[PDB]
mmCIF file of N, CA, C and O in Angstrom:
data_model
loop_
_atom_site.group_PDB
_atom_site.id
_atom_site.type_symbol
_atom_site.label_atom_id
_atom_site.label_comp_id
_atom_site.label_asym_id
_atom_site.label_seq_id
_atom_site.Cartn_x
_atom_site.Cartn_y
_atom_site.Cartn_z
ATOM 1 N N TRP O 99 -71.460 78.321 -108.478
ATOM 2 C CA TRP O 99 -72.767 77.985 -107.865
ATOM 3 C C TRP O 99 -73.905 78.262 -108.835
ATOM 4 O O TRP O 99 -73.858 79.217 -109.611
ATOM 5 N N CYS O 100 -74.930 77.424 -108.784
ATOM 6 C CA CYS O 100 -76.102 77.603 -109.622
ATOM 7 C C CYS O 100 -77.129 78.465 -108.900
ATOM 8 O O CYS O 100 -77.469 78.207 -107.746
ATOM 9 N N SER O 101 -77.596 79.506 -109.565
ATOM 10 C CA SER O 101 -78.560 80.411 -108.966
ATOM 11 C C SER O 101 -79.974 79.865 -109.126
ATOM 12 O O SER O 101 -80.846 80.098 -108.288
ATOM 13 N N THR O 102 -80.188 79.118 -110.198
ATOM 14 C CA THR O 102 -81.490 78.526 -110.475
ATOM 15 C C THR O 102 -81.633 77.185 -109.749
ATOM 16 O O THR O 102 -81.957 76.163 -110.351
ATOM 17 N N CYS O 103 -81.373 77.202 -108.447
ATOM 18 C CA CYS O 103 -81.433 75.993 -107.641
ATOM 19 C C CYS O 103 -82.121 76.266 -106.313
ATOM 20 O O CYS O 103 -81.512 76.801 -105.385
ATOM 21 N N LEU O 104 -83.395 75.925 -106.231
ATOM 22 C CA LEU O 104 -84.119 76.030 -104.978
ATOM 23 C C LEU O 104 -84.406 74.637 -104.443
ATOM 24 O O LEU O 104 -83.790 74.191 -103.474
ATOM 25 N N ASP O 105 -85.316 73.945 -105.110
ATOM 26 C CA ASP O 105 -85.672 72.583 -104.747
ATOM 27 C C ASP O 105 -86.040 71.798 -105.996
ATOM 28 O O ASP O 105 -87.158 71.904 -106.505
ATOM 29 N N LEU O 106 -85.083 71.040 -106.504
ATOM 30 C CA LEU O 106 -85.282 70.264 -107.724
ATOM 31 C C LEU O 106 -85.536 68.798 -107.389
ATOM 32 O O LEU O 106 -84.983 67.901 -108.034
ATOM 33 N N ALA O 107 -86.383 68.572 -106.380
ATOM 34 C CA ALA O 107 -86.680 67.235 -105.865
ATOM 35 C C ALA O 107 -87.180 66.299 -106.962
ATOM 36 O O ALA O 107 -88.385 66.116 -107.145
ATOM 37 N N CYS O 108 -86.233 65.715 -107.681
ATOM 38 C CA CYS O 108 -86.525 64.843 -108.803
ATOM 39 C C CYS O 108 -87.297 65.595 -109.877
ATOM 40 O O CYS O 108 -88.314 65.120 -110.383
ATOM 41 N N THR O 109 -86.807 66.782 -110.216
ATOM 42 C CA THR O 109 -87.336 67.517 -111.351
ATOM 43 C C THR O 109 -86.741 66.917 -112.620
ATOM 44 O O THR O 109 -87.218 67.139 -113.733
ATOM 45 N N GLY O 110 -85.708 66.116 -112.408
ATOM 46 C CA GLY O 110 -85.014 65.454 -113.482
ATOM 47 C C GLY O 110 -83.528 65.424 -113.216
ATOM 48 O O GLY O 110 -82.920 66.464 -112.982
ATOM 49 N N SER O 111 -82.936 64.240 -113.211
ATOM 50 C CA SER O 111 -81.499 64.124 -113.013
ATOM 51 C C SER O 111 -80.760 64.871 -114.115
ATOM 52 O O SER O 111 -79.823 65.625 -113.850
ATOM 53 N N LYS O 112 -81.218 64.690 -115.349
ATOM 54 C CA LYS O 112 -80.647 65.395 -116.489
ATOM 55 C C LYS O 112 -80.884 66.897 -116.357
ATOM 56 O O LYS O 112 -80.113 67.707 -116.870
ATOM 57 N N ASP O 113 -81.945 67.266 -115.645
ATOM 58 C CA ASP O 113 -82.223 68.670 -115.373
ATOM 59 C C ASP O 113 -81.222 69.203 -114.362
ATOM 60 O O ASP O 113 -80.710 70.309 -114.510
ATOM 61 N N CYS O 114 -80.939 68.386 -113.352
ATOM 62 C CA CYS O 114 -80.026 68.752 -112.276
ATOM 63 C C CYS O 114 -78.566 68.649 -112.704
ATOM 64 O O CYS O 114 -77.685 69.165 -112.018
ATOM 65 N N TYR O 115 -78.311 67.974 -113.823
ATOM 66 C CA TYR O 115 -76.957 67.883 -114.378
ATOM 67 C C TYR O 115 -76.325 69.264 -114.540
ATOM 68 O O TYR O 115 -75.178 69.479 -114.147
ATOM 69 N N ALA O 116 -77.076 70.201 -115.105
ATOM 70 C CA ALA O 116 -76.568 71.551 -115.327
ATOM 71 C C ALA O 116 -76.306 72.282 -113.999
ATOM 72 O O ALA O 116 -75.195 72.764 -113.779
ATOM 73 N N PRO O 117 -77.313 72.387 -113.099
ATOM 74 C CA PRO O 117 -77.121 72.957 -111.760
ATOM 75 C C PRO O 117 -75.934 72.349 -111.018
ATOM 76 O O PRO O 117 -75.123 73.069 -110.438
ATOM 77 N N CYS O 118 -75.832 71.024 -111.040
ATOM 78 C CA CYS O 118 -74.744 70.332 -110.362
ATOM 79 C C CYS O 118 -73.405 70.725 -110.978
ATOM 80 O O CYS O 118 -72.430 70.963 -110.263
ATOM 81 N N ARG O 119 -73.370 70.819 -112.304
ATOM 82 C CA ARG O 119 -72.184 71.286 -113.009
ATOM 83 C C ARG O 119 -71.822 72.695 -112.555
ATOM 84 O O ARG O 119 -70.667 72.993 -112.256
ATOM 85 N N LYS O 120 -72.833 73.549 -112.484
ATOM 86 C CA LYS O 120 -72.642 74.944 -112.119
ATOM 87 C C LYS O 120 -72.350 75.094 -110.624
ATOM 88 O O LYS O 120 -71.863 76.129 -110.178
ATOM 89 N N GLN O 121 -72.661 74.061 -109.855
ATOM 90 C CA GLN O 121 -72.430 74.078 -108.420
ATOM 91 C C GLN O 121 -71.043 73.539 -108.089
ATOM 92 O O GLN O 121 -70.254 74.215 -107.434
ATOM 93 N N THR O 122 -70.748 72.327 -108.540
ATOM 94 C CA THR O 122 -69.514 71.653 -108.149
ATOM 95 C C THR O 122 -68.452 71.706 -109.244
ATOM 96 O O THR O 122 -67.256 71.693 -108.955
ATOM 97 N N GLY O 123 -68.891 71.772 -110.495
ATOM 98 C CA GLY O 123 -67.973 71.662 -111.613
ATOM 99 C C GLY O 123 -68.164 70.357 -112.358
ATOM 100 O O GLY O 123 -67.722 70.201 -113.497
ATOM 101 N N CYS O 124 -68.838 69.418 -111.711
ATOM 102 C CA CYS O 124 -69.105 68.119 -112.302
ATOM 103 C C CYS O 124 -70.609 67.909 -112.452
ATOM 104 O O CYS O 124 -71.351 67.985 -111.479
ATOM 105 N N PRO O 125 -71.076 67.643 -113.684
ATOM 106 C CA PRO O 125 -72.510 67.540 -113.999
ATOM 107 C C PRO O 125 -73.106 66.165 -113.705
ATOM 108 O O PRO O 125 -74.072 65.753 -114.340
ATOM 109 N N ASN O 126 -72.533 65.460 -112.754
ATOM 110 C CA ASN O 126 -72.995 64.118 -112.422
ATOM 111 C C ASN O 126 -73.761 64.116 -111.099
ATOM 112 O O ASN O 126 -73.169 64.277 -110.025
ATOM 113 N N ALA O 127 -75.079 63.939 -111.186
ATOM 114 C CA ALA O 127 -75.941 63.965 -110.010
ATOM 115 C C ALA O 127 -77.146 63.039 -110.171
ATOM 116 O O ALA O 127 -77.473 62.601 -111.278
ATOM 117 N N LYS O 128 -77.798 62.740 -109.052
ATOM 118 C CA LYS O 128 -79.022 61.949 -109.046
ATOM 119 C C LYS O 128 -79.944 62.465 -107.944
ATOM 120 O O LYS O 128 -79.473 62.868 -106.881
ATOM 121 N N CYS O 129 -81.247 62.472 -108.193
ATOM 122 C CA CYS O 129 -82.184 62.979 -107.204
ATOM 123 C C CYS O 129 -82.538 61.898 -106.183
ATOM 124 O O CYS O 129 -83.208 60.913 -106.492
ATOM 125 N N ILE O 130 -82.040 62.088 -104.974
ATOM 126 C CA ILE O 130 -82.295 61.196 -103.854
ATOM 127 C C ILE O 130 -82.393 62.032 -102.592
ATOM 128 O O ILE O 130 -81.858 63.135 -102.550
ATOM 129 N N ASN O 131 -83.088 61.528 -101.575
ATOM 130 C CA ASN O 131 -83.257 62.277 -100.326
ATOM 131 C C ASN O 131 -84.055 63.565 -100.600
ATOM 132 O O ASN O 131 -84.026 64.525 -99.836
ATOM 133 N N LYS O 132 -84.803 63.541 -101.706
ATOM 134 C CA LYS O 132 -85.599 64.679 -102.167
ATOM 135 C C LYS O 132 -84.696 65.844 -102.589
ATOM 136 O O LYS O 132 -85.078 67.012 -102.508
ATOM 137 N N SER O 133 -83.495 65.516 -103.045
ATOM 138 C CA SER O 133 -82.572 66.515 -103.563
ATOM 139 C C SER O 133 -81.649 65.897 -104.612
ATOM 140 O O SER O 133 -81.368 64.704 -104.582
ATOM 141 N N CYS O 134 -81.204 66.696 -105.566
ATOM 142 C CA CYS O 134 -80.275 66.200 -106.568
ATOM 143 C C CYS O 134 -78.855 66.213 -106.024
ATOM 144 O O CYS O 134 -78.161 67.232 -106.083
ATOM 145 N N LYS O 135 -78.436 65.076 -105.485
ATOM 146 C CA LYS O 135 -77.134 64.968 -104.852
ATOM 147 C C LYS O 135 -76.062 64.712 -105.897
ATOM 148 O O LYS O 135 -76.234 63.873 -106.785
ATOM 149 N N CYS O 136 -74.970 65.441 -105.785
ATOM 150 C CA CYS O 136 -73.840 65.277 -106.681
ATOM 151 C C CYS O 136 -72.873 64.246 -106.109
ATOM 152 O O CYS O 136 -72.742 64.122 -104.892
ATOM 153 N N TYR O 137 -72.198 63.513 -106.983
ATOM 154 C CA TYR O 137 -71.296 62.448 -106.553
ATOM 155 C C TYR O 137 -69.927 63.001 -106.169
ATOM 156 O O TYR O 137 -68.935 62.264 -106.139
ATOM 157 N N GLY O 138 -69.880 64.291 -105.870
ATOM 158 C CA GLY O 138 -68.634 64.926 -105.502
ATOM 159 C C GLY O 138 -67.859 65.420 -106.703
ATOM 160 O O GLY O 138 -67.994 64.882 -107.804
ATOM 161 N N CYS O 139 -67.062 66.451 -106.494
ATOM 162 C CA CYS O 139 -66.226 66.999 -107.547
ATOM 163 C C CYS O 139 -65.107 67.827 -106.924
ATOM 164 O O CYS O 139 -65.230 69.067 -106.873
#
């Protein structure tokens, strides 16, 4: 899990890549719904 994750509402998909990696294991995400949603992992 990423600790540096509060609300990255389109702070940058490439920015959320790291959090998403640290969250799911897969650094593939996009900011939608006002959140960086991961494509699953």
